[PDB]
Amino acid sequence: RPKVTKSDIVDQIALNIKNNNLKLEKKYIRLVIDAFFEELKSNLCSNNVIEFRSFGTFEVRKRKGRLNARNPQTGEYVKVLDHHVAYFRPGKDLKERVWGIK
Amino acid sequence: RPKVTKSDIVDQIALNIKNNNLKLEKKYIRLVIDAFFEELKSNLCSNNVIEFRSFGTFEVRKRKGRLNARNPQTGEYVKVLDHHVAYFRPGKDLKERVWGIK
């Protein structure tokens, strides 16, 4: 049940990369990862669909607003407008490797 | 509706990276990205929580099975066991840049 950070991942990618007799400076790894997220965000804003086979797909989905909305704290009915949301849709490999988990 | 691929993203990261007077071979970019996904998957399998401050969080969630399940095609009642699923939970920046979208 641990909490992994962009930093840990960057370190792991460092390992993973060297395990295959390759050498890349954590510097460049951190760099790619940042550009990666930046690029993914803008891509999402443009309402594009990014697909990474064997992992998952990112896309924007529409979501109907409500009036029934509730303020968890007070119960006061709140209004929510029809908006859009970032959605990750799991790929075969990922979906199957996670299905039966302890 | 457009469709972006791991390849296009890799190219965009190439651009993004050079726009900031830096030079990294598409080779190494493709590399990081692959190790990135690899590492994220195993991290998910270990039922860890990966957090990328203001972008989103990945985590495994439990999902109750059913009997009511249906075969979209035939209507035949199907059974589904309690399992786990990969879930992406949008971060502030992402959730806000996507909210009001045409």
Add this chain to the structure above:
DNA sequence: GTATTTAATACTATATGTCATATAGTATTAAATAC
């Protein structure tokens, strides 16, 4: 690498009903590969 500073998340209450789910076979198309 470490110390400092800023701001994103976890946390929480608990009604409500939208939206992802289930299937499998065909046509695409991502993308790994060797060139």
Add this chain to the structure above:
DNA sequence: GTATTTAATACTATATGTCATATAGTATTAAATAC
């Protein structure tokens, strides 16, 4: 870079009810920064 080959996705039917949602203020903590 391009052509070839393999296998992951899009696509689709449409009942069902789980599960994410709304809020905001406090304590954490990711992580960008300059050293």
